Amino acid sequence: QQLKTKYNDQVRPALMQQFGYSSVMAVPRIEKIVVNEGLGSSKEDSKAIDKAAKELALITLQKPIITKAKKSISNFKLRQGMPVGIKVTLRGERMYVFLEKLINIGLPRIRDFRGINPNAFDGRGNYNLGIKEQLIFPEITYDMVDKTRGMDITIVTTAKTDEEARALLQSMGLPF
RNA sequence: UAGUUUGACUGGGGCGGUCGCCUCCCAAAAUGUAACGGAGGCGCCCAAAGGUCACCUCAAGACGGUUGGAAAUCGUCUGUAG
Ligand SMILES: [Mg+2]
Ligand SMILES: [Mg+2]
Ligand SMILES: [Mg+2]
């Protein structure tokens, strides 16, 4: 908790020194961290989908919500109004913890050349994150969770400039 | 054996089709207006698809992304409505 706030307060002068803003509020900040499970790659019965909501909830200390299918009957087993993937917003203390879970000791570090190769491009916030697999926890035991879905995790931050995206990882404990 | 019934429109009768209600064009910028003229629906539904109170905003595109990738799902930008 206090460590994430200290890294925020160390980043903000670091950005005012690499790029002076008139205001600390002009500095980039991190708004929310979202994690989107998408069990439409493995649509199931209530059993498996509630189990995946169960595992994200155990990871989060939050209740995940189900995103529900849009009107879009299609070739690909698509229907009308049915679940098609969990979603979890995080703001406040529940958010920063996860990032401090990920920057520091709670990182699985199961695989890492560097950080995921940069994707925001335009440099305003939206830093999308792909976890190809969830063999990345001590929360699971692999023989029982022999299924391994992936995860999407989008970082949302203010940033009116492209290069300023470099601030949200380099000084934020993320490899670049 | 007996008393009867056996529909109409119909560019002649028959055959085919049609017979009630709703929508559009025809319909000539009022209302109305024919055709066996051009198109298509209804003979139901909903214990909530009502009353009320309160709250949300939709398509679609592009950039980015986990088993998905032309289109699952999340994320930003545009977005009097497509
Ligand atoms: Mg006659
Ligand atoms: Mg008239
Ligand atoms: Mg007349």
Tab-separated table of C-alpha atoms (C1' of nucleotides) and ligand atoms in Angstrom:
chain	number	residue	atom	x	y	z
A	1	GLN	CA	0.000	0.000	0.000
A	2	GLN	CA	2.377	2.756	1.147
A	3	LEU	CA	5.009	1.539	-1.348
A	4	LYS	CA	2.740	2.058	-4.365
A	5	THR	CA	2.006	5.611	-3.218
A	6	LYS	CA	5.723	6.248	-2.723
A	7	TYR	CA	6.404	5.074	-6.267
A	8	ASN	CA	3.633	7.389	-7.488
A	9	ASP	CA	5.220	10.317	-5.638
A	10	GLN	CA	8.655	9.406	-6.995
A	11	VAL	CA	7.343	9.137	-10.552
A	12	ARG	CA	5.611	12.518	-10.539
A	13	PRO	CA	8.809	14.591	-9.963
A	14	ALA	CA	10.616	12.183	-12.298
A	15	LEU	CA	8.172	13.221	-15.018
A	16	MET	CA	8.342	16.901	-14.101
A	17	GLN	CA	12.150	16.605	-14.486
A	18	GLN	CA	12.019	14.621	-17.730
A	19	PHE	CA	9.218	16.917	-18.982
A	20	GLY	CA	8.102	19.910	-16.952
A	21	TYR	CA	4.410	20.350	-16.303
A	22	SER	CA	3.077	23.487	-14.654
A	23	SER	CA	1.088	21.175	-12.365
A	24	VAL	CA	1.471	17.850	-10.596
A	25	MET	CA	-2.066	17.152	-11.856
A	26	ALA	CA	-0.783	17.660	-15.431
A	27	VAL	CA	1.587	14.728	-14.790
A	28	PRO	CA	0.364	11.343	-16.035
A	29	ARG	CA	-1.512	9.307	-13.439
A	30	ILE	CA	-3.018	5.821	-13.563
A	31	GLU	CA	-6.838	5.894	-13.535
A	32	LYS	CA	-7.939	2.251	-13.449
A	33	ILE	CA	-6.737	-1.275	-14.166
A	34	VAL	CA	-9.186	-3.548	-15.973
A	35	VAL	CA	-8.924	-7.322	-16.448
A	36	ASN	CA	-11.122	-9.018	-19.060
A	37	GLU	CA	-11.602	-12.753	-19.051
A	38	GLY	CA	-13.209	-13.953	-22.254
A	39	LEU	CA	-14.529	-17.494	-21.824
A	40	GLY	CA	-16.201	-17.268	-25.265
A	41	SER	CA	-13.138	-19.136	-26.495
A	42	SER	CA	-14.440	-21.842	-24.153
A	43	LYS	CA	-18.132	-21.176	-23.652
A	44	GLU	CA	-19.317	-23.715	-21.129
A	45	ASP	CA	-22.080	-24.489	-18.677
A	46	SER	CA	-22.596	-22.493	-15.497
A	47	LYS	CA	-20.044	-24.743	-13.802
A	48	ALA	CA	-16.842	-23.756	-15.624
A	49	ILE	CA	-17.804	-20.098	-16.083
A	50	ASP	CA	-18.650	-19.656	-12.400
A	51	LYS	CA	-15.360	-21.402	-11.598
A	52	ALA	CA	-13.444	-18.821	-13.652
A	53	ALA	CA	-15.327	-15.978	-12.002
A	54	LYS	CA	-14.412	-17.733	-8.751
A	55	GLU	CA	-10.698	-17.730	-9.546
A	56	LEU	CA	-10.605	-14.084	-10.641
A	57	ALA	CA	-12.538	-13.167	-7.481
A	58	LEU	CA	-10.102	-15.098	-5.294
A	59	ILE	CA	-7.242	-13.300	-7.028
A	60	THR	CA	-8.870	-9.877	-6.627
A	61	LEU	CA	-10.985	-9.616	-3.484
A	62	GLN	CA	-13.659	-8.330	-5.879
A	63	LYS	CA	-16.792	-9.768	-7.437
A	64	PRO	CA	-16.194	-10.083	-11.200
A	65	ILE	CA	-19.051	-9.125	-13.544
A	66	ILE	CA	-20.067	-11.099	-16.607
A	67	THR	CA	-20.044	-9.281	-19.920
A	68	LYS	CA	-23.083	-10.403	-21.895
A	69	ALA	CA	-23.373	-11.159	-25.590
A	70	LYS	CA	-24.630	-8.456	-27.907
A	71	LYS	CA	-27.400	-9.078	-30.420
A	72	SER	CA	-25.223	-10.655	-33.132
A	73	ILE	CA	-26.314	-14.095	-34.357
A	74	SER	CA	-23.338	-15.475	-36.234
A	75	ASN	CA	-21.554	-18.473	-37.695
A	76	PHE	CA	-19.455	-18.992	-34.574
A	77	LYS	CA	-21.992	-20.511	-32.131
A	78	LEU	CA	-23.140	-16.947	-31.403
A	79	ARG	CA	-26.455	-16.369	-29.673
A	80	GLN	CA	-28.534	-13.480	-28.348
A	81	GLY	CA	-28.200	-12.671	-24.646
A	82	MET	CA	-25.711	-14.945	-22.884
A	83	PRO	CA	-22.410	-14.572	-21.001
A	84	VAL	CA	-19.292	-14.172	-23.149
A	85	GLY	CA	-16.532	-13.170	-20.755
A	86	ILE	CA	-15.819	-11.770	-17.312
A	87	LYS	CA	-14.771	-8.166	-16.694
A	88	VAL	CA	-13.173	-6.600	-13.594
A	89	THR	CA	-12.478	-2.908	-13.037
A	90	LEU	CA	-10.081	-1.837	-10.295
A	91	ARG	CA	-9.616	1.655	-8.895
A	92	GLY	CA	-8.266	2.892	-5.617
A	93	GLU	CA	-6.519	0.583	-3.165
A	94	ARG	CA	-7.755	-2.565	-4.917
A	95	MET	CA	-6.056	-1.406	-8.147
A	96	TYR	CA	-2.632	-0.240	-6.967
A	97	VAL	CA	-2.233	-3.416	-4.906
A	98	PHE	CA	-2.477	-5.471	-8.081
A	99	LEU	CA	0.105	-3.322	-9.797
A	100	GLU	CA	2.307	-3.623	-6.696
A	101	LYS	CA	1.438	-7.301	-6.854
A	102	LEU	CA	2.755	-7.254	-10.434
A	103	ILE	CA	5.706	-4.846	-10.343
A	104	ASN	CA	7.265	-6.534	-7.266
A	105	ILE	CA	7.318	-9.847	-5.456
A	106	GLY	CA	3.944	-11.061	-6.625
A	107	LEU	CA	4.969	-11.089	-10.268
A	108	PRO	CA	4.889	-14.722	-11.418
A	109	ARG	CA	7.932	-13.983	-13.636
A	110	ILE	CA	7.080	-17.312	-15.305
A	111	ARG	CA	8.245	-15.894	-18.644
A	112	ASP	CA	9.963	-12.598	-19.436
A	113	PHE	CA	12.441	-11.543	-22.098
A	114	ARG	CA	11.568	-7.895	-21.359
A	115	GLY	CA	8.235	-6.199	-20.899
A	116	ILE	CA	5.568	-6.968	-23.438
A	117	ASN	CA	6.623	-5.204	-26.603
A	118	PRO	CA	5.139	-1.705	-26.701
A	119	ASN	CA	1.596	-1.364	-28.025
A	120	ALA	CA	0.050	1.988	-27.003
A	121	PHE	CA	1.870	3.637	-29.952
A	122	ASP	CA	-0.187	6.852	-29.832
A	123	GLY	CA	1.106	7.229	-26.267
A	124	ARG	CA	-2.098	8.273	-24.545
A	125	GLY	CA	-2.775	5.918	-21.627
A	126	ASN	CA	-4.359	2.696	-22.944
A	127	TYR	CA	-1.536	0.205	-22.430
A	128	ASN	CA	-3.070	-3.152	-23.256
A	129	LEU	CA	-1.543	-6.238	-21.663
A	130	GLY	CA	-1.757	-9.855	-22.784
A	131	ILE	CA	-1.205	-12.855	-20.537
A	132	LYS	CA	-1.097	-15.823	-22.928
A	133	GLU	CA	-1.644	-18.201	-19.989
A	134	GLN	CA	-2.392	-18.209	-16.261
A	135	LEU	CA	0.283	-20.732	-15.201
A	136	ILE	CA	1.377	-17.632	-13.310
A	137	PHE	CA	0.052	-18.108	-9.777
A	138	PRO	CA	0.584	-19.876	-6.498
A	139	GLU	CA	-3.214	-19.481	-6.201
A	140	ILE	CA	-3.786	-22.481	-8.479
A	141	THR	CA	-2.692	-26.122	-8.555
A	142	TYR	CA	-2.006	-27.073	-12.155
A	143	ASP	CA	-3.400	-30.631	-12.210
A	144	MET	CA	-6.896	-29.443	-11.163
A	145	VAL	CA	-6.848	-26.255	-13.245
A	146	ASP	CA	-5.378	-28.138	-16.192
A	147	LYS	CA	-7.340	-25.699	-18.374
A	148	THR	CA	-5.407	-22.460	-18.999
A	149	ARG	CA	-7.307	-19.483	-20.361
A	150	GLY	CA	-5.461	-16.226	-21.015
A	151	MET	CA	-6.165	-12.715	-19.736
A	152	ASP	CA	-6.332	-9.143	-21.046
A	153	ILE	CA	-5.369	-6.239	-18.750
A	154	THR	CA	-5.699	-2.661	-20.023
A	155	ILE	CA	-3.963	0.178	-18.199
A	156	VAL	CA	-5.772	3.508	-18.467
A	157	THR	CA	-3.728	6.648	-17.769
A	158	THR	CA	-3.899	10.249	-18.813
A	159	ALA	CA	-1.280	11.222	-21.410
A	160	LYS	CA	-1.731	13.951	-24.030
A	161	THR	CA	1.636	13.030	-25.636
A	162	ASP	CA	2.977	9.862	-27.288
A	163	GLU	CA	6.438	9.737	-25.690
A	164	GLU	CA	4.910	10.284	-22.242
A	165	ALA	CA	3.719	6.658	-22.301
A	166	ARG	CA	7.335	5.756	-21.540
A	167	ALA	CA	6.749	7.232	-18.085
A	168	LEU	CA	4.062	4.767	-17.072
A	169	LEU	CA	6.330	1.706	-17.046
A	170	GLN	CA	10.000	2.716	-16.856
A	171	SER	CA	9.593	4.624	-13.611
A	172	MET	CA	6.604	2.394	-12.744
A	173	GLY	CA	8.575	-0.790	-12.179
A	174	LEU	CA	7.895	-2.265	-15.555
A	175	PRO	CA	10.557	-3.382	-18.053
A	176	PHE	CA	10.927	-1.397	-21.262
B	1	U	C1'	-89.140	-42.783	-53.181
B	2	A	C1'	-89.553	-37.333	-52.181
B	3	G	C1'	-88.573	-32.013	-51.288
B	4	U	C1'	-84.491	-29.100	-51.977
B	5	U	C1'	-79.212	-26.872	-51.449
B	6	U	C1'	-74.941	-26.679	-55.146
B	7	G	C1'	-71.659	-18.099	-53.540
B	8	A	C1'	-69.696	-13.868	-55.979
B	9	C	C1'	-65.769	-10.788	-58.549
B	10	U	C1'	-64.313	-12.222	-63.455
B	11	G	C1'	-61.811	-7.061	-70.158
B	12	G	C1'	-67.384	-13.713	-72.430
B	13	G	C1'	-68.170	-18.593	-68.627
B	14	G	C1'	-64.931	-22.409	-66.803
B	15	C	C1'	-59.817	-23.225	-64.430
B	16	G	C1'	-56.356	-20.351	-61.423
B	17	G	C1'	-56.679	-16.486	-58.125
B	18	U	C1'	-59.625	-13.101	-54.547
B	19	C	C1'	-63.426	-12.098	-50.549
B	20	G	C1'	-62.037	-9.466	-43.482
B	21	C	C1'	-58.182	-6.036	-40.888
B	22	C	C1'	-53.015	-3.349	-41.122
B	23	U	C1'	-48.456	-0.675	-44.207
B	24	C	C1'	-46.557	1.834	-48.667
B	25	C	C1'	-46.687	3.797	-53.843
B	26	C	C1'	-50.322	4.843	-57.394
B	27	A	C1'	-53.336	9.359	-55.131
B	28	A	C1'	-52.277	14.441	-59.613
B	29	A	C1'	-48.100	19.070	-52.303
B	30	A	C1'	-55.966	19.578	-48.453
B	31	U	C1'	-59.414	14.762	-46.927
B	32	G	C1'	-60.811	11.397	-50.494
B	33	U	C1'	-60.138	8.286	-55.040
B	34	A	C1'	-60.213	2.365	-59.466
B	35	A	C1'	-57.905	-1.855	-61.330
B	36	C	C1'	-57.381	-9.982	-61.576
B	37	G	C1'	-52.275	-2.383	-60.655
B	38	G	C1'	-46.970	-2.356	-58.119
B	39	A	C1'	-44.832	-4.326	-52.844
B	40	G	C1'	-45.724	-7.072	-47.530
B	41	G	C1'	-47.866	-8.201	-43.341
B	42	C	C1'	-52.427	-9.925	-39.079
B	43	G	C1'	-56.378	-13.848	-36.954
B	44	C	C1'	-51.161	-12.602	-31.855
B	45	C	C1'	-48.343	-11.471	-27.867
B	46	C	C1'	-46.306	-9.362	-22.720
B	47	A	C1'	-47.738	-11.356	-14.584
B	48	A	C1'	-44.332	-7.897	-17.041
B	49	A	C1'	-42.817	-6.056	-23.418
B	50	G	C1'	-47.892	-2.840	-17.877
B	51	G	C1'	-48.501	2.016	-13.762
B	52	U	C1'	-45.137	4.655	-11.504
B	53	C	C1'	-40.315	6.130	-9.491
B	54	A	C1'	-35.200	6.232	-10.442
B	55	C	C1'	-30.995	5.353	-13.248
B	56	C	C1'	-27.995	4.121	-18.298
B	57	U	C1'	-27.191	5.446	-24.434
B	58	C	C1'	-27.074	3.044	-29.289
B	59	A	C1'	-24.899	1.382	-34.381
B	60	A	C1'	-19.910	1.323	-37.066
B	61	G	C1'	-15.022	2.414	-37.656
B	62	A	C1'	-9.762	2.776	-36.537
B	63	C	C1'	-5.222	1.850	-33.034
B	64	G	C1'	-4.184	-2.206	-29.064
B	65	G	C1'	-4.731	-6.509	-27.324
B	66	U	C1'	-5.476	-14.155	-23.714
B	67	U	C1'	-6.589	-19.595	-26.227
B	68	G	C1'	-10.251	-15.383	-30.771
B	69	G	C1'	-8.971	-12.943	-34.992
B	70	A	C1'	-12.743	-10.254	-41.385
B	71	A	C1'	-16.856	-10.231	-36.886
B	72	A	C1'	-16.222	-13.383	-29.676
B	73	U	C1'	-14.813	-10.068	-24.996
B	74	C	C1'	-12.165	-5.710	-22.693
B	75	G	C1'	-9.562	-0.777	-23.836
B	76	U	C1'	-9.013	4.253	-25.814
B	77	C	C1'	-10.461	8.039	-30.027
B	78	U	C1'	-14.479	9.543	-33.524
B	79	G	C1'	-19.560	8.859	-32.861
B	80	U	C1'	-28.221	14.245	-33.894
B	81	A	C1'	-28.176	8.292	-34.853
B	82	G	C1'	-25.903	5.794	-39.753
C	1	MG	MG	-71.098	-15.596	-61.935
C	2	MG	MG	-54.027	13.183	-50.960
C	3	MG	MG	-65.467	5.853	-59.291
